Amino acid sequence: LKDAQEKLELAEKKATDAEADVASLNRRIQLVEEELDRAQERLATALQKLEEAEK
């Protein structure tokens, strides 16, 4: 018993550190993916504004 319960607080500790890092990295991926459609969208507009001004 001491061994199954000790193996435990360690496996549950690891499970919670990994769930915490996946939540953080998924929040970071959604924010960088959202910074994106924004960077790329104002891009289609800045390049179009260039082709018209160059003309």
């Binding site: 607080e9 500790k13 919670t16 550190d17 915490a20 953080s24």
Partner: protein, 372 residues
């Protein structure tokens, strides 16, 4: 449905209000417990002159207002400013009219008789709610974890408490209050982090130390050989990126902050700490009920969310309790809303209807009626 839908649950805290409808799983509204008063005359573009600000608009605009906290250490200290936070809760946050909704409110552990009568006076006489009810906070936390006997370590923004409850009755003479909580804890991190060689200079630096505390702080078990570990310098370190690039690193202090809850001496507090206090509450109770309390240490409150809090407490009280005893530290995941959820359950319940204090009871018995 009349009131099945209609019951409101408002949990008034020292830092946050949690609010919503009995029935829901979590608070519809969560916001700071502040009331800002503008230091100068003037306006925002498109708005009129505002006499007052509450919740997040008071926090966001804090540079031109004098901020005030109505609830000091869980007790309502200013009733003019509290009626302001309630008004905001009903009318703006939940957008309901209060005069057709039963309202379950919460109070603190040894809340003065006179206060429970005063918020009843204000609920019925200035908000005109149909019926209301005041539950004690630890008692709703316990109940939300299914049980009726246990001891709650409750810890939020301005207070920590231990409230031993037996078949529902919170035990007045065994309750302990420790005035050191998450607020105290953010300010201590602040200093051990400036002391790490940093500067939280502008207000956008100040606020985020609190978001560092919430995201990266830990309660290590064997806090002893965790400092020792810090020194060998493992990949224990943790860098957070600020509002801008300014990547700040926090390795070690990460757990030196919640070690404050076991050692108040870290902050010039001479009081005993969380685990000893759990215990002392317990050797202040009847003898025959002490096995029950020990197997039912329910945790609730924002500051009890630090990971590994439960393991440290587990081992903290096993090693103070007689070995013949079973220790059991329950810490649920939703614990930052236990109190609220316990109220949602209770107030949406089928049997609670007969404990609601109605305007009939009040207009006929005076504030005494709900006071119990």
């Amino acid at each position: 449905d009349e009131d099945e839908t209609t019951a409101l649950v408002c949990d008034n805290g020292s830092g946050l209000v949690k609010a919503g409808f009995a029935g829901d799983d979590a608070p519809r509204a969560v916001f700071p417990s502040i009331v800002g008063r503008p230091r100068h005359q003037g306006v925002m573009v498109g708005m009129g002159q505002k006499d007052s600000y509450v919740g997040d608009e008071a926090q966001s605009k804090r540079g031109i207002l004098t901020l005030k906290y109505p609830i000091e250490h869980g007790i309502i200290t200013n009733w003019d400013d509290m009626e302001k936070i309630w008004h905001h809760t009903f009318y703006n946050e939940l957008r309901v009219a209060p005069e057709e909704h039963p309202t379950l409110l919460t109070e603190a552990p040894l809340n003065p008789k006179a206060n429970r009568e005063k918020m009843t006076q204000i609920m019925f006489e200035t908000f005109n709610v149909p019926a209301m009810y005041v539950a004690i906070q630890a008692v709703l936390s316990l109940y939300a974890s299914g049980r009726t006997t246990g001891i709650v370590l409750d810890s939020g923004d301005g207070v920590t408490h231990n409230v031993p409850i037996y078949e529902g009755y919170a035990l007045p003479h065994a309750i302990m209050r420790l005035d050191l909580a998450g607020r105290d804890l953010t300010d201590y991190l602040m200093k051990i982090l400036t002391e790490r060689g940093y500067s939280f200079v502008t207000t956008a630096e100040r606020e985020i130390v609190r978001d560092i505390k919430e995201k990266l702080c830990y309660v290590a078990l064997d806090f002893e050989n965790e400092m020792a570990t810090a020194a060998s310098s493992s990949s224990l370190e943790k860098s957070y990126e600020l509002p801008d690039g300014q990547v700040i690193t926090i390795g070690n202090e990460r757990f030196r902050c919640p070690e404050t809850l076991f050692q108040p001496s870290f902050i010039g507090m001479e009081s005993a700490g969380i685990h000893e206090t759990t215990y002392n509450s317990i050797m202040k109770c009847d003898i025959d009920i002490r096995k029950d309390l020990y197997a039912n240490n329910v945790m609730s409150g924002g500051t009890t969310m630090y990971p590994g809090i439960a393991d440290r407490m587990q081992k903290e009280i096993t090693a103070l309790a007689p070995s013949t005893m079973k220790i059991k530290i329950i810490a649920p995941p939703e614990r930052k809303y236990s109190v609220w959820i316990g109220g949602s359950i209770l107030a949406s319940l089928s049997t609670f209807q007969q404990m609601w204090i109605t305007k009939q009871e009040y207009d006929e018995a005076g504030p005494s009626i709900v006071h119990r």
